[PDB]
């Protein structure tokens, strides 16, 4: 969807805020985490380097390496808020 903020997160990857509130992080290994706003159903969509996508909702426990990676998203959300104007 339309990026409204995008920042490089050194040592982690590239983070994007999409126009409808989803936050995505593309990690250095090609994995992607999408954090879905609670208003849109919440949860996490995680795509492995091999292309496999999994949705983790409320009540799903997060396996390795998803749990630790999702644990980094709050700090990245704050970085996106203070991100420069895109461009």
Author numbering: 658 to 744
Question: Paper's wording?
Answer:
PLK4, and this interaction targets STIL to centrioles. allows homo-multimerisation, the interaction with the PB3 domain of PLK4, or both. structures and interactions of CCDs and PLK4-PB3s in humans and flies. STIL/Ana2, which can then interact with and recruit Sas-6.
1.53 Å shown in green in cartoon representation. six-stranded beta sheet with an alpha helix packed against one side. behaved as a monomer in solution. Drosophila PB3 and CCD do not detectably interact. equivalent fly proteins do not interact in this way. results suggest that its function may differ between species. humans but is regulated in flies, perhaps by post-translational regulation.
